[PDB]
CSV table of C-alpha atoms and ligand atoms in Angstrom, one decimal:
chain,number,residue,atom,x,y,z
A,7,UNK,CA,50.4,-10.9,7.4
A,8,UNK,CA,46.8,-13.1,8.5
A,9,UNK,CA,44.0,-10.8,10.3
A,10,UNK,CA,44.2,-9.2,13.6
A,11,UNK,CA,41.8,-6.5,15.4
A,12,UNK,CA,40.7,-3.7,15.6
A,13,UNK,CA,42.1,-0.9,17.6
A,14,UNK,CA,40.6,1.8,19.6
A,15,UNK,CA,40.8,5.7,19.2
A,16,UNK,CA,43.8,6.5,20.8
A,17,UNK,CA,43.2,10.1,22.1
A,18,UNK,CA,46.8,12.9,22.3
A,19,UNK,CA,48.1,14.0,25.5
A,20,UNK,CA,49.4,17.2,25.5
A,21,UNK,CA,53.2,17.2,26.8
A,22,UNK,CA,55.6,14.5,27.5
A,23,UNK,CA,58.1,13.1,30.0
A,24,UNK,CA,60.8,10.6,30.1
A,25,UNK,CA,61.9,8.6,28.0
A,26,UNK,CA,61.2,4.8,28.5
A,27,UNK,CA,63.1,3.0,31.2
A,28,UNK,CA,62.8,-1.1,30.6
A,29,UNK,CA,64.5,-3.7,32.4
A,30,UNK,CA,67.1,-5.9,30.0
A,31,UNK,CA,66.9,-9.8,30.9
A,32,UNK,CA,69.9,-9.9,28.9
A,33,UNK,CA,71.7,-7.1,31.3
A,34,UNK,CA,70.1,-8.2,34.2
A,35,UNK,CA,69.5,-4.1,34.4
A,36,UNK,CA,67.8,-1.2,33.7
A,37,UNK,CA,68.3,0.3,30.0
A,38,UNK,CA,67.4,2.7,28.6
A,39,UNK,CA,64.6,2.7,25.2
A,40,UNK,CA,66.3,4.8,22.7
A,41,UNK,CA,64.0,3.9,19.2
A,42,UNK,CA,64.9,5.2,16.3
A,43,UNK,CA,61.8,8.1,14.8
A,44,UNK,CA,59.9,3.7,13.8
A,45,UNK,CA,59.9,1.9,17.5
A,46,UNK,CA,60.2,-1.5,16.9
A,47,UNK,CA,58.8,-4.2,18.8
A,48,UNK,CA,58.4,-7.7,18.5
A,49,UNK,CA,56.6,-9.9,21.2
A,50,UNK,CA,56.4,-13.6,20.7
A,51,UNK,CA,52.1,-14.5,20.0
A,52,UNK,CA,49.9,-17.2,21.6
A,53,UNK,CA,50.0,-20.8,20.7
A,54,UNK,CA,46.1,-21.5,19.5
A,55,UNK,CA,45.1,-22.7,22.5
A,56,UNK,CA,43.0,-22.6,25.8
A,57,UNK,CA,41.4,-18.8,24.1
A,58,UNK,CA,43.8,-15.8,25.7
A,59,UNK,CA,44.0,-17.1,29.0
A,60,UNK,CA,45.2,-14.0,31.8
A,61,UNK,CA,48.5,-15.3,31.2
A,62,UNK,CA,48.1,-14.4,27.4
A,63,UNK,CA,47.1,-11.1,28.4
A,64,UNK,CA,49.6,-10.1,30.8
A,65,UNK,CA,51.4,-10.7,28.5
A,66,UNK,CA,50.5,-8.5,25.6
A,67,UNK,CA,49.4,-6.0,27.6
A,68,UNK,CA,52.4,-5.2,29.4
A,69,UNK,CA,54.0,-4.9,26.2
A,70,UNK,CA,50.2,-2.5,25.2
A,71,UNK,CA,52.1,-0.1,28.1
A,72,UNK,CA,55.3,0.5,25.8
A,73,UNK,CA,53.5,0.4,22.7
A,74,UNK,CA,51.2,3.4,24.4
A,75,UNK,CA,54.1,4.5,26.0
A,76,UNK,CA,56.0,4.9,22.9
A,77,UNK,CA,52.9,6.8,20.9
A,78,UNK,CA,52.7,8.4,23.6
A,79,UNK,CA,56.5,10.1,22.8
A,80,UNK,CA,55.8,10.5,18.8
A,81,UNK,CA,57.1,7.4,17.9
A,82,UNK,CA,55.5,5.4,15.5
A,83,UNK,CA,55.7,1.5,15.9
A,84,UNK,CA,56.2,-1.1,14.1
A,85,UNK,CA,54.8,-4.6,16.0
A,86,UNK,CA,55.2,-7.4,14.7
A,87,UNK,CA,53.2,-10.4,16.1
A,88,UNK,CA,53.5,-14.5,15.0
A,89,UNK,CA,50.8,-17.4,16.2
A,90,UNK,CA,52.5,-20.1,16.5
A,91,UNK,CA,50.2,-22.3,14.6
A,92,UNK,CA,51.8,-25.4,14.0
A,93,UNK,CA,53.3,-26.8,17.2
A,94,UNK,CA,53.5,-29.9,19.1
A,95,UNK,CA,52.2,-29.0,21.7
A,96,UNK,CA,48.8,-27.3,19.6
A,97,UNK,CA,48.9,-31.2,17.9
A,98,UNK,CA,48.9,-33.0,21.5
A,99,UNK,CA,46.0,-30.9,22.6
A,100,UNK,CA,43.5,-31.1,19.3
A,101,UNK,CA,44.6,-35.0,19.8
A,102,UNK,CA,43.2,-34.7,23.3
A,103,UNK,CA,39.7,-32.7,22.7
A,104,UNK,CA,39.4,-34.5,19.3
A,105,UNK,CA,38.9,-31.7,16.7
A,106,UNK,CA,41.7,-30.8,14.0
A,107,UNK,CA,44.8,-28.5,15.2
A,108,UNK,CA,43.8,-26.3,11.5
A,109,UNK,CA,40.7,-26.3,13.3
A,110,UNK,CA,41.4,-25.4,17.0
A,111,UNK,CA,44.1,-23.1,16.1
A,112,UNK,CA,41.8,-21.6,13.7
A,113,UNK,CA,39.2,-20.9,16.6
A,114,UNK,CA,41.3,-20.0,19.5
A,115,UNK,CA,43.2,-17.6,17.1
A,116,UNK,CA,39.7,-15.8,15.9
A,117,UNK,CA,38.6,-16.3,20.5
A,118,UNK,CA,42.1,-14.2,21.0
A,119,UNK,CA,41.5,-11.3,18.4
A,120,UNK,CA,38.2,-10.5,20.0
A,121,UNK,CA,39.3,-10.9,23.7
A,122,UNK,CA,42.3,-8.6,21.8
A,123,UNK,CA,40.1,-5.9,21.1
A,124,UNK,CA,37.5,-6.2,24.0
A,125,UNK,CA,40.2,-5.7,26.3
A,126,UNK,CA,41.5,-2.5,24.1
A,127,UNK,CA,44.9,-3.7,23.1
A,128,UNK,CA,46.2,-1.9,20.2
A,129,UNK,CA,47.5,-4.1,17.2
A,130,UNK,CA,50.3,-6.0,16.1
A,131,UNK,CA,50.9,-4.0,12.4
A,132,UNK,CA,52.0,-7.1,11.3
A,133,UNK,CA,50.3,-10.7,12.1
A,134,UNK,CA,52.1,-13.1,10.9
A,135,UNK,CA,51.4,-17.1,11.4
A,136,UNK,CA,54.3,-19.5,12.0
A,137,UNK,CA,52.9,-21.9,8.1
A,138,UNK,CA,53.2,-18.4,6.5
A,139,UNK,CA,56.7,-18.0,7.1
A,140,UNK,CA,57.5,-20.8,5.7
A,141,UNK,CA,59.1,-20.0,2.7
A,142,UNK,CA,61.4,-17.3,5.4
A,143,UNK,CA,62.5,-20.0,7.0
A,144,UNK,CA,63.9,-21.7,5.1
A,145,UNK,CA,65.6,-19.0,3.1
A,146,UNK,CA,67.4,-18.5,6.5
A,147,UNK,CA,68.3,-22.1,7.1
A,148,UNK,CA,69.6,-22.5,3.6
A,149,UNK,CA,71.9,-18.9,4.6
A,150,UNK,CA,73.0,-21.0,7.8
A,151,UNK,CA,73.9,-24.2,6.3
A,152,UNK,CA,75.8,-22.8,3.5
A,153,UNK,CA,78.5,-20.9,6.6
A,154,UNK,CA,78.5,-24.5,8.6
A,155,UNK,CA,76.2,-22.3,11.4
A,156,UNK,CA,74.1,-25.3,10.6
A,157,UNK,CA,74.3,-29.3,9.6
A,158,UNK,CA,72.4,-32.2,8.4
A,159,UNK,CA,72.2,-35.3,11.2
A,160,UNK,CA,73.9,-38.6,10.0
A,161,UNK,CA,70.6,-40.0,9.5
A,162,UNK,CA,69.0,-41.2,6.5
A,163,UNK,CA,65.3,-42.0,7.2
A,164,UNK,CA,65.1,-38.5,9.4
A,165,UNK,CA,67.9,-36.4,8.3
A,166,UNK,CA,66.9,-33.0,11.1
A,167,UNK,CA,68.9,-30.5,10.2
A,168,UNK,CA,70.4,-28.7,13.7
A,169,UNK,CA,71.7,-25.4,14.6
A,170,UNK,CA,75.4,-25.5,16.0
A,171,UNK,CA,75.1,-24.1,19.4
A,172,UNK,CA,78.5,-22.9,19.1
A,173,UNK,CA,77.7,-20.9,15.9
A,174,UNK,CA,77.7,-17.9,18.4
A,175,UNK,CA,80.4,-17.1,20.8
A,176,UNK,CA,78.1,-15.0,22.7
A,177,UNK,CA,75.7,-17.7,22.6
A,178,UNK,CA,73.7,-18.1,26.5
A,179,UNK,CA,74.4,-13.7,27.3
A,180,UNK,CA,70.4,-12.8,26.9
A,181,UNK,CA,69.8,-15.9,29.8
A,182,UNK,CA,73.4,-15.7,31.1
A,183,UNK,CA,72.3,-20.1,31.6
A,184,UNK,CA,75.2,-23.0,32.5
A,185,UNK,CA,75.5,-25.6,30.3
A,186,UNK,CA,73.5,-27.8,32.9
A,187,UNK,CA,70.9,-24.8,33.8
A,188,UNK,CA,70.3,-25.6,30.5
A,189,UNK,CA,70.3,-29.2,29.4
A,190,UNK,CA,67.4,-28.8,32.5
A,191,UNK,CA,65.0,-26.4,30.7
A,192,UNK,CA,67.0,-27.3,26.4
A,193,UNK,CA,64.5,-31.1,28.0
A,194,UNK,CA,61.6,-29.8,29.7
A,195,UNK,CA,60.2,-27.3,27.0
A,196,UNK,CA,60.7,-29.6,23.5
A,197,UNK,CA,64.6,-30.0,23.0
A,198,UNK,CA,66.1,-32.7,22.2
A,199,UNK,CA,69.6,-33.4,24.2
A,200,UNK,CA,69.6,-37.1,23.5
A,201,UNK,CA,68.8,-36.9,20.0
A,202,UNK,CA,71.5,-39.4,18.0
A,203,UNK,CA,74.1,-38.0,15.5
A,204,UNK,CA,73.7,-34.1,17.2
A,205,UNK,CA,77.3,-32.5,17.5
A,206,UNK,CA,76.1,-30.9,20.9
A,207,UNK,CA,72.6,-32.2,23.1
A,208,UNK,CA,72.3,-28.1,23.1
A,209,UNK,CA,72.1,-27.8,19.4
A,210,UNK,CA,68.8,-26.7,18.5
A,211,UNK,CA,66.1,-28.2,15.4
A,212,UNK,CA,66.1,-25.3,12.8
A,213,UNK,CA,64.2,-28.6,10.0
A,214,UNK,CA,62.4,-31.5,11.2
A,215,UNK,CA,62.4,-34.4,8.8
A,216,UNK,CA,59.3,-35.8,7.3
A,217,UNK,CA,57.8,-38.3,9.6
A,218,UNK,CA,54.3,-40.3,9.6
A,219,UNK,CA,51.5,-38.7,10.5
A,220,UNK,CA,53.0,-35.3,10.7
A,221,UNK,CA,52.6,-32.4,7.9
A,222,UNK,CA,55.6,-31.4,5.9
A,223,UNK,CA,56.2,-29.0,3.8
A,224,UNK,CA,59.5,-29.0,0.3
A,225,UNK,CA,62.3,-27.4,1.1
A,226,UNK,CA,66.2,-27.4,-0.2
A,227,UNK,CA,66.7,-29.6,2.7
A,228,UNK,CA,64.0,-32.2,2.1
A,229,UNK,CA,60.5,-32.4,3.1
A,230,UNK,CA,59.6,-31.4,6.7
A,231,UNK,CA,58.7,-28.5,9.0
A,232,UNK,CA,60.0,-25.6,10.8
A,233,UNK,CA,62.1,-25.7,14.1
A,234,UNK,CA,60.1,-23.6,16.7
A,235,UNK,CA,62.6,-20.8,17.8
A,236,UNK,CA,63.7,-20.4,13.9
A,237,UNK,CA,60.2,-19.3,13.0
A,238,UNK,CA,60.1,-16.2,15.8
A,239,UNK,CA,63.8,-15.5,14.6
A,240,UNK,CA,63.0,-15.3,10.8
A,241,UNK,CA,59.9,-13.7,11.3
A,242,UNK,CA,61.5,-10.6,13.4
A,243,UNK,CA,64.4,-10.8,11.1
A,244,UNK,CA,62.3,-10.3,7.6
A,245,UNK,CA,59.7,-7.9,8.9
A,246,UNK,CA,62.1,-5.4,11.5
A,247,UNK,CA,66.0,-6.1,10.1
A,248,UNK,CA,68.3,-5.6,12.7
A,249,UNK,CA,67.0,-3.0,14.3
A,250,UNK,CA,65.0,-4.9,16.7
A,251,UNK,CA,64.3,-2.5,20.0
A,252,UNK,CA,62.0,-4.9,22.0
A,253,UNK,CA,61.8,-7.9,21.2
A,254,UNK,CA,59.6,-9.9,24.2
A,255,UNK,CA,57.3,-12.5,25.3
A,256,UNK,CA,56.3,-15.2,28.4
A,257,UNK,CA,58.6,-15.8,30.9
A,258,UNK,CA,59.9,-19.0,30.4
A,259,UNK,CA,60.7,-17.5,26.2
A,260,UNK,CA,64.1,-16.4,28.0
A,261,UNK,CA,65.4,-19.9,27.7
A,262,UNK,CA,65.7,-21.7,25.3
A,263,UNK,CA,63.2,-19.6,23.4
A,264,UNK,CA,64.9,-16.3,23.0
A,265,UNK,CA,68.0,-17.5,23.4
A,266,UNK,CA,67.8,-19.6,19.8
A,267,UNK,CA,66.0,-17.4,17.9
A,268,UNK,CA,68.3,-14.5,18.4
A,269,UNK,CA,71.5,-16.6,17.7
A,270,UNK,CA,69.9,-18.3,14.3
A,271,UNK,CA,69.9,-14.2,14.1
A,272,UNK,CA,73.3,-13.0,15.5
A,273,UNK,CA,75.2,-16.1,13.1
A,274,UNK,CA,72.9,-15.4,9.7
A,275,UNK,CA,73.2,-11.7,10.1
A,276,UNK,CA,76.7,-11.2,11.5
A,277,UNK,CA,75.8,-8.9,14.4
A,278,UNK,CA,76.5,-9.1,18.1
A,279,UNK,CA,72.7,-8.4,19.0
A,280,UNK,CA,69.6,-9.9,17.5
A,281,UNK,CA,67.2,-7.0,20.5
A,282,UNK,CA,68.4,-4.8,22.3
A,283,UNK,CA,66.4,-5.2,25.2
A,284,UNK,CA,64.5,-8.4,25.9
A,285,UNK,CA,61.1,-8.2,27.5
A,286,UNK,CA,59.8,-10.9,29.7
A,287,UNK,CA,56.8,-10.9,31.9
A,288,UNK,CA,53.0,-13.7,32.5
A,289,UNK,CA,51.4,-14.7,34.6
A,290,UNK,CA,51.2,-18.4,37.0
A,291,UNK,CA,47.4,-19.5,37.9
A,292,UNK,CA,46.5,-20.5,40.9
A,293,UNK,CA,48.7,-23.3,41.6
A,294,UNK,CA,51.6,-21.4,41.1
A,295,UNK,CA,51.8,-23.0,37.3
A,296,UNK,CA,51.4,-22.3,34.0
A,297,UNK,CA,47.5,-21.3,33.1
A,298,UNK,CA,46.4,-25.0,31.1
A,299,UNK,CA,43.4,-26.8,30.6
A,300,UNK,CA,44.9,-29.7,31.4
A,301,UNK,CA,45.5,-28.4,35.1
A,302,UNK,CA,42.3,-26.9,36.2
A,303,UNK,CA,43.7,-23.0,35.9
A,304,UNK,CA,42.9,-21.5,33.3
A,305,UNK,CA,40.4,-18.0,34.0
A,306,UNK,CA,40.1,-17.3,30.7
A,307,UNK,CA,39.3,-13.5,29.5
A,308,UNK,CA,35.8,-14.3,27.9
A,309,UNK,CA,34.8,-16.7,31.6
A,310,UNK,CA,35.2,-12.7,33.3
A,311,UNK,CA,33.4,-10.9,30.6
A,312,UNK,CA,30.8,-13.5,30.4
A,313,UNK,CA,30.8,-13.4,34.4
A,314,UNK,CA,29.6,-9.1,34.0
A,315,UNK,CA,33.6,-8.3,34.4
A,316,UNK,CA,34.9,-5.1,32.9
A,317,UNK,CA,38.3,-5.2,30.1
A,318,UNK,CA,39.0,-2.0,31.9
A,319,UNK,CA,39.2,-4.4,35.2
A,320,UNK,CA,41.3,-7.4,34.1
A,321,UNK,CA,43.6,-5.0,33.1
A,322,UNK,CA,43.9,-2.8,36.1
A,323,UNK,CA,43.9,-6.0,38.2
A,324,UNK,CA,46.2,-7.2,36.3
A,325,UNK,CA,47.8,-3.5,36.6
A,326,UNK,CA,48.0,-3.9,40.5
A,327,UNK,CA,51.5,-5.5,40.2
A,328,UNK,CA,54.4,-4.9,38.1
A,329,UNK,CA,55.3,-7.3,35.1
A,330,UNK,CA,58.2,-8.4,37.2
A,331,UNK,CA,57.6,-9.4,40.2
A,332,UNK,CA,55.7,-12.9,40.7
A,333,UNK,CA,51.2,-11.7,39.5
A,334,UNK,CA,48.7,-13.2,40.7
A,335,UNK,CA,45.2,-13.2,40.1
A,336,UNK,CA,42.1,-13.8,42.9
A,337,UNK,CA,38.4,-12.3,44.1
A,338,UNK,CA,40.5,-10.4,46.4
A,339,UNK,CA,42.5,-8.6,43.3
A,340,UNK,CA,38.5,-8.6,41.1
A,341,UNK,CA,38.3,-6.9,44.3
A,342,UNK,CA,40.5,-3.7,43.8
A,343,UNK,CA,40.1,-3.5,40.7
A,344,UNK,CA,36.2,-2.9,40.2
A,345,UNK,CA,36.8,-0.8,43.0
A,346,UNK,CA,39.8,1.2,41.6
A,347,UNK,CA,37.4,1.1,38.5
A,348,UNK,CA,34.2,1.9,40.1
A,349,UNK,CA,36.1,5.1,41.9
A,350,UNK,CA,38.2,6.7,39.1
A,351,UNK,CA,35.0,6.6,36.8
A,352,UNK,CA,33.5,9.0,40.0
A,353,UNK,CA,36.5,11.5,40.0
A,354,UNK,CA,36.0,11.9,36.1
A,355,UNK,CA,32.1,11.8,36.3
A,356,UNK,CA,33.0,14.8,38.8
A,357,UNK,CA,31.6,18.6,37.6
A,358,UNK,CA,35.4,19.9,38.6
A,359,UNK,CA,38.4,19.0,39.9
A,360,UNK,CA,41.9,19.8,40.8
A,361,UNK,CA,44.1,20.5,38.3
A,362,UNK,CA,45.3,17.2,37.1
A,363,UNK,CA,49.4,18.0,35.2
A,364,UNK,CA,50.8,17.0,38.7
A,365,UNK,CA,48.8,12.9,38.6
A,366,UNK,CA,49.3,12.9,34.3
A,367,UNK,CA,53.7,14.3,34.9
A,368,UNK,CA,53.4,11.5,38.1
A,369,UNK,CA,51.7,8.8,35.9
A,370,UNK,CA,54.0,9.8,32.4
A,371,UNK,CA,57.1,9.2,34.8
A,372,UNK,CA,55.9,6.2,36.7
A,373,UNK,CA,54.9,4.2,33.3
A,374,UNK,CA,58.5,5.5,32.2
A,375,UNK,CA,60.3,3.9,34.9
A,376,UNK,CA,60.1,0.3,34.6
A,377,UNK,CA,56.0,-0.4,33.5
A,378,UNK,CA,56.1,1.4,37.1
A,379,UNK,CA,52.1,0.8,37.3
A,380,UNK,CA,51.4,-0.3,40.6
A,381,UNK,CA,52.8,3.4,42.0
A,382,UNK,CA,51.4,5.2,38.5
A,383,UNK,CA,48.2,3.8,39.7
A,384,UNK,CA,48.3,5.1,43.1
A,385,UNK,CA,49.5,8.2,41.8
A,386,UNK,CA,45.6,7.8,40.6
A,387,UNK,CA,44.0,7.0,43.8
A,388,UNK,CA,45.2,9.8,45.3
A,389,UNK,CA,44.8,13.0,43.0
A,390,UNK,CA,40.9,11.0,42.8
A,391,UNK,CA,40.8,10.9,47.2
A,392,UNK,CA,41.9,14.6,46.1
A,393,UNK,CA,39.3,15.2,44.1
A,394,UNK,CA,36.2,12.9,46.0
A,395,UNK,CA,37.4,14.2,49.2
A,396,UNK,CA,37.9,17.6,48.5
A,397,UNK,CA,36.9,18.7,45.2
A,398,UNK,CA,38.1,21.9,42.5
A,399,UNK,CA,37.6,23.9,40.0
A,400,UNK,CA,38.9,23.0,37.1
A,401,UNK,CA,36.2,22.7,34.8
A,402,UNK,CA,38.2,20.0,32.4
A,403,UNK,CA,40.3,17.9,34.3
A,404,UNK,CA,38.6,15.6,35.1
A,405,UNK,CA,37.9,14.5,31.6
A,406,UNK,CA,41.8,15.0,31.0
A,407,UNK,CA,42.4,12.5,33.5
A,408,UNK,CA,40.0,10.2,31.7
A,409,UNK,CA,41.4,10.9,28.3
A,410,UNK,CA,44.8,9.7,29.9
A,411,UNK,CA,44.2,6.9,31.5
A,412,UNK,CA,43.0,5.9,28.1
A,413,UNK,CA,46.3,6.8,26.2
A,414,UNK,CA,48.5,5.7,28.2
A,415,UNK,CA,46.4,2.2,30.3
A,416,UNK,CA,44.4,1.9,28.0
A,417,UNK,CA,40.8,1.6,31.2
A,418,UNK,CA,37.8,2.9,29.8
A,419,UNK,CA,36.4,5.2,32.2
B,7,LIG,C1,55.3,-18.0,33.8
B,7,LIG,O1,53.7,-18.1,32.8
B,7,LIG,C2,53.4,-17.6,31.6
B,7,LIG,C3,54.0,-18.6,31.2
B,7,LIG,C4,54.1,-18.2,29.5
B,7,LIG,C5,52.9,-17.6,28.9
B,7,LIG,C6,52.5,-17.4,27.5
B,7,LIG,C7,52.4,-15.9,27.2
B,7,LIG,C8,52.2,-15.9,26.1
B,7,LIG,C9,52.0,-16.7,24.7
B,7,LIG,C10,52.1,-18.3,25.4
B,7,LIG,S1,51.8,-19.4,23.9
B,7,LIG,O2,52.1,-20.8,25.3
B,7,LIG,O3,50.3,-19.2,24.4
B,7,LIG,N1,52.8,-19.4,22.6
B,7,LIG,C11,54.0,-19.5,23.1
B,7,LIG,O4,55.4,-19.2,24.9
B,7,LIG,C12,54.8,-19.4,21.8
B,7,LIG,N2,54.0,-19.6,20.9
B,7,LIG,C13,55.5,-18.4,21.7
B,7,LIG,S2,56.5,-18.2,20.0
B,7,LIG,C14,52.4,-18.2,27.2
B,7,LIG,C15,52.0,-16.5,30.2
B,7,LIG,N3,52.6,-16.7,31.7
B,8,LIG,CA1,51.9,13.4,23.2
B,9,LIG,CA1,33.8,25.3,42.0
B,10,LIG,ZN1,58.1,-17.0,19.4
């Protein structure tokens, strides 16, 4: 698809640890991740404004660990990620900024590429802009209308196309939310529960009819533009198929976004479950809200880099907390990450060190146990403190620890 970014070198660490076990948002429990020879991952990409904030970084670094752990286990990986380059919040920001929405989106997607490369994040194999996926959205809305899962609303001026929330009997399995909770979150996260003519308040926009002052594309259901959830449903389905191991993204995507994107794909395919695991993570700003320029809580990766922060310290700072805990950035967090990075660099610069077999095995076990980076970091702290306090006589373990931290954590010592 679009140009993404360059991968760093990935060293190969001899040996293997346990297979990855991951919490599944849908079943609300840790379950084994069991891919075929090619493991498949779709992670919802950015809406291209506000650069790469630390919420972005926390999300895509978490899936970088999965990517890296799959490669460590010998899997081939198919990583697909989108860009929501046409989007109502994007239009709003562009109008507020006095800039064209495509100039804004192109510029911010480029800043994302640069931050992802600086953070040494492994790139997706297919990087797909929403505007380049219109045809696949159209093909799949055609299928949804043919089966009756979708309908055109009775509105001559604005004949929007909607997906029936009861098109699948299992609608709601991924979030587990009841109707009242869905109504609240649907309204506050882009849905239109009060739109006249819908069969159910929870019916989701599939194709928004042409409006004055809005970009539009041709289609057999009239000129318009895609709904948000069917964009990612169609990209994931057409690129990966039904054998999706992981659907991932930020915390707020549990509902409505991933609930409907799964329901759209299960309805067209007849399959019971779109993805085997649903994985959510992110990070709030200082005020407990998602990071946004208009809140004055926005911390950008490029800001940290301009202040002289090592990108590996950003990774370590984000990894100091578990991805399903409420992570928060602060000066204290940055300071411990800087001190941890310097400590690790000291030990891996030693002429000789104690055997690294146990700590590498322990790091692999902790990462395999629902990405327990706090305990993996603590195990490395312990090996480093033993090497620096008491020493050892393996001339290879300093480099071997550095290469493992590189391959598995993306941290460059
Ligand atoms: C609760 O804290 C959070 C909340 C949200 C996020 C986050 C992560 C990645 C991308 C985006 S996003 O807003 O840029 N884009 C989209 O959600 C769509 N393009 C998906 S298709 C937000 C992080 N931390
Ligand atoms: Ca290996
Ligand atoms: Ca010696
Ligand atoms: Zn998405």
